[PDB]
Paper text:
Proteins attached to the surface of group A and group B streptococcal human pathogens that contain tandemly arrayed Rib domains have been associated with invasive infections and proposed as potential vaccine candidates. Here, we study Rib domains from Rib, R28, and from a surface protein from Lactobacillus acidophilus. Together, these 5 structures of homologous Rib domains, and further sequence analyses, show Rib is an example of domain atrophy, a rare event in domain structural evolution involving the loss of core secondary structure elements, and also reveal the remarkable structural malleability of this domain family. The structure, molecular dynamics simulations, and small angle X-ray scattering of a Rib domain pair suggest tandemly arrayed domains are likely to form an elongated rod on the bacterial cell surface, thus suggesting a possible mechanism of immune evasion mediated through domain number variation.
We hypothesized that some members of the Rib domain that have long insertions in the position of the characteristic Rib D-E strand atrophy may retain the full Ig fold and thus represent something akin to the ancestral form of the atrophied Rib domain. Thus, we solved the structure of “Rib Long” (RibL) (residues 1165 to 1268) and “Rib Standard” (RibS) (residues 1269 to 1329) at resolutions of 1.07 Å and 1.25 Å, respectively. As predicted, the Ig-fold D/E strands missing from RibR and R28N are also missing from RibS but are present in the RibL structure. Thus, RibL comprises a full Ig-like fold which likely represents the ancestral state of the Rib domain, and RibS is an example of evolutionarily recent domain atrophy from RibL; this is remarkable because there are very few cases where we have the structure of both atrophied and nonatrophied domains that are closely related in sequence. RibS belongs to the “Rib” subfamily, giving a Cα rmsd value of 0.6 Å for superposition with both RibR and RibR28N, versus a Cα rmsd of 2.3 Å for RibL. A longer Rib domain contains the full Ig fold and likely represents an ancestral preatrophy structure, thus providing a rare example of a closely related pair of structures of an atrophied domain with its ancestral form. In the atrophy of the Ig-like RibL, a significant loss of the structure (∼20% compared to RibR/RibS) is involved, but the domains remain thermostable with melting temperatures (Tms) of 78 °C and 88 °C for RibL and RibS, respectively, and 71 °C for RibR. As Rib (RibR, R28N, and RibS), RibL, and aRib form 3 distinct Rib subfamilies, this begins to shed light on the evolutionary pathway of a fold where an ancestral Ig-like fold (RibL) has lost core secondary structures (RibR) and diversified in structure (aRib).
Residue numbers in the entry: 1163 to 1268
The structure:
Amino acid sequence: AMGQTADDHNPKYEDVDVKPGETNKVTPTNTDKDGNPANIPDGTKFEKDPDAPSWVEVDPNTGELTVAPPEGTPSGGHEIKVKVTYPDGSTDEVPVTVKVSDPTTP
């Protein structure tokens, strides 16, 4: 079998909308080359882009995203990246859209 594990997986994160002082958690979903749900391979590792906000964290083993903007964080949108490394050393860059909403009043 030729190719890379990355060719057979398509991790995805739902959009995040979070107010200052909230904590939201997002589990990546995943589909195969045919578009059908599939589990991410065990041993896959996850790392946020080092330029991502300090208040976005990515579980290194599971890829779960914890988004916890402090009080005082400005409202606004962010387009961030998570690097996925499969156990064969292949990689994917996976985006997440993170909106910080106003604390009280949209």
